[PDB]
Amino acid sequence: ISIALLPFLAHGHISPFFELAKQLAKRNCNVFLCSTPINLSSIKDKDSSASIKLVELHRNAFETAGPTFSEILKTLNPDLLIYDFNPSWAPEIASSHNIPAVYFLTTAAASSSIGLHAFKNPGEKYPFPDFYDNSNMKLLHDFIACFERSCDIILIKSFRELEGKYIDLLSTLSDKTLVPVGPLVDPKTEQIINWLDKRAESTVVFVCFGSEYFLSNEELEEVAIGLEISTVNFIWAVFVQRVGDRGLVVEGWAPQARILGHSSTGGFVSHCGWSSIAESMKFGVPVIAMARHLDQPLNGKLAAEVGVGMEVVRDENGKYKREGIAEVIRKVVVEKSGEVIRRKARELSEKMKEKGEQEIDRAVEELVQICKKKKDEQ
């Protein structure tokens, strides 16, 4: 019934853990304990009366706060622990208190399946050349650990409608049952909504590259002029700002969820972050893939494999050109050739909401199953 969460010390992992906390606190009234440093928990203090936040005070010294978290568990004594990828000692300290440990993967199943296959099956080739064409130690073991030490199941921030094939592959490779929990979700924003509401339905393209790379004056040019000749409305949260074909540039944080959820948005030029793609698919907004580093390319083609997006065609090797961007924008958002993509995005969104609440409900009942298998000898 009671669960304790130990995310990693990064706001990219605090939000998914906190949203999972809110989701598990509204079902089965799971007593919820979330272990975060006071500075990290401070940001989440807004609508969390359901969860209970617990402080943790410490080369991240995180790799030294083992006994501190041991003391926290000795006081809290949760019926189960949900750990992240890098705490390392989390699974070990939990077992020293006879607490079953379940791993929470906040990344796509395919990107992890890449490395997990290269270990479980060394020379057997990835099962799909289209996605990955296969044809020094002290880190590979630390990647599999969180999969190996996970008790029975592995929770994943993903949904079957996007990568059920890769989720099943990860299940077989890890020998664990992959349990998907689906996707998980200031006076300066009124101008944003007042602008988007006065535009027609599914005609605005939302452009954002997260905060990974502000690009450069050389790369901002290729996307700015590409948006100019696209001849479509856009909200590009970062021509000459005054000849922009009906667009709005924003400096810092933008209403990403509120823009994708607005009915006037019918396109999302994205760097293909996992949370970004999940949000784009929960609101039925097709994806314009413009990845560059990390697992973002694998994500992009992933959404391109299922048909809810399209990648820009690279003319060079470092970056793309305005034509490559304008062509795909016009094809997806405003042209008939992209109707396949738009239809799929809406149908998949309906499905993600048609099978609503069951996935986390099944996850909760399987977690309770884990807890009851541990009721051995009282």
Numbering used by the authors: 8 to 65, 91 to 167, 178 to 227, 236 to 288, 303 to 442
How is this structure described in the published paper?
Pq3‐O‐UGT2, an important UDP‐dependent glycosyltransferase (UGT), catalyzes the production of Ginsenoside Rg3 and Rd by extending the glycan chain of Ginsenoside Rh2 and F2, respectively, with higher selectivity for F2. Pq3‐O‐UGT2 catalyzes glucose transfer from UDP‐Glucose (UDP‐Glc) to the C2‐OH of the C3‐glucose of Ginsenoside Rh2 and F2, respectively. In this study, we elucidated the crystal structures of both apo Pq3‐O‐UGT2 and its complexes with Ginsenoside Rh2 and F2, revealing the acceptor recognition mechanisms of Pq3‐O‐UGT2. The NTD contains a seven‐stranded parallel β‐sheet sandwiched by seven helices, while the CTD comprises a 6‐stranded parallel β‐sheet flanked by 6 helices.
To elucidate the underlying molecular mechanisms, we solved crystal structures of apo Pq3‐O‐UGT2 and its complex with Rh2 at resolutions of 2.9 and 3.5 Å, respectively. The apo structure adopted a P1 space group with four molecules in the asymmetric unit, while the Pq3‐O‐UGT2‐Rh2 complex exhibited a P212121 space group with two molecules in the asymmetric unit. PISA analysis indicated the absence of higher‐order assemblies in solution, consistent with the monomeric state observed via gel filtration. The C‐terminal helix (Cα7) extends from the CTD to the NTD, stabilizing the two‐lobe structure of Pq3‐O‐UGT2. Alignment of the AlphaFold2 predicted Pq3‐O‐UGT2 structure with each of the four molecules in the asymmetric unit suggests that the absence of density in Nβ3‐Nα3, Nα5‐Nα6, and Cβ2‐Cα3 is likely due to spatial conflict during crystal packing, while the missing density of the intermediate loop may result from flexibility. Comparison of the apo and complex structures reveals significant conformational changes in the NTD.
